[PDB]
From Swiss-Prot:
This is Protease 2A. Zn(2+) 1 binds at C50, C52, C110, H112. Cysteine protease that cleaves viral polyprotein and specific host proteins. It is responsible for the autocatalytic cleavage between the P1 and P2 regions, which is the first cleavage occurring in the polyprotein. Also cleaves the host translation initiation factor EIF4G1, in order to shut down the capped cellular mRNA translation. Inhibits the host nucleus-cytoplasm protein and RNA trafficking by cleaving host members of the nuclear pores. Counteracts stress granule formation probably by antagonizing its assembly or promoting its dissassembly. It catalyses: Selective cleavage of Tyr-|-Gly bond in the picornavirus polyprotein. It comes from Coxsackievirus A16 (strain G-10). The active site is at H15 (for protease 2a activity), D33 (for protease 2a activity), C104 (for protease 2a activity). Homodimer. The chain holds residues 869 to 1007 of 2193 of the full protein.
Length: 139
């Protein structure tokens, strides 16, 4: 689990969104595994606006942050689960590293701020849903 709180927005993995998230839905994209809901309290997380390919992510299944190199956001094949059939998830970034299903929502960060959140994993590759292109999150 995990979310990004910026302004009056809460950004979570779509497969983990709550009833409250859906009742206060702002935007959702199944092809990106992202959902944004509105909040009453103001959030102060900083979204990175960059092309960084290095960062650090939080891995809850190890209580540790790991430094990784990751690919630029792109369309990648994702095997089916109880949340989705087999499909191509877009705006996804891969890195060599450990993850478990419960790690989804762990933040990936660079020197400029929040890059994205853990969304996919398996066979030693961890995938992050990018949020750096969502300029409206800051307005
Ligand atoms: N974005 C999706 O379609 C995900 C929905 C939930 C299932 N899924 C995963 O990759 C599960 C996962 C995540 C992280 N580490 C792992 N070792 C296994 C795909
Ligand atoms: Zn950066």
């Amino acid at each position: 689990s995990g979310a990004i709180y910026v302004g009056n927005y809460r950004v979570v993995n779509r497969h983990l969104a709550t009833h409250n998230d859906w009742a206060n839905l702002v935007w959702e994209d199944s092809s990106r595994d992202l959902l944004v809901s509105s909040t009453t309290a103001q959030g102060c997380d900083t979204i990175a606006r960059c092309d960084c390919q290095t960062g650090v992510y939080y891995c809850s299944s190890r209580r540790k942050h790991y430094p990784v190199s990751f690919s630029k956001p792109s369309l990648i094949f994702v095997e089916a689960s109880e949340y989705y059939p087999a499909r191509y998830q877009s705006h996804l970034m891969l890195a060599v590293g450990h993850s478990e299903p419960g790690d989804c929502g762990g933040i990936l960060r660079c020197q400029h701020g929040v890059v994205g959140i853990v969304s996919t994993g398996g066979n030693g590759l961890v995938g992050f849903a990018d949020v750096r292109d969502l300029l409206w999150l800051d307005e």
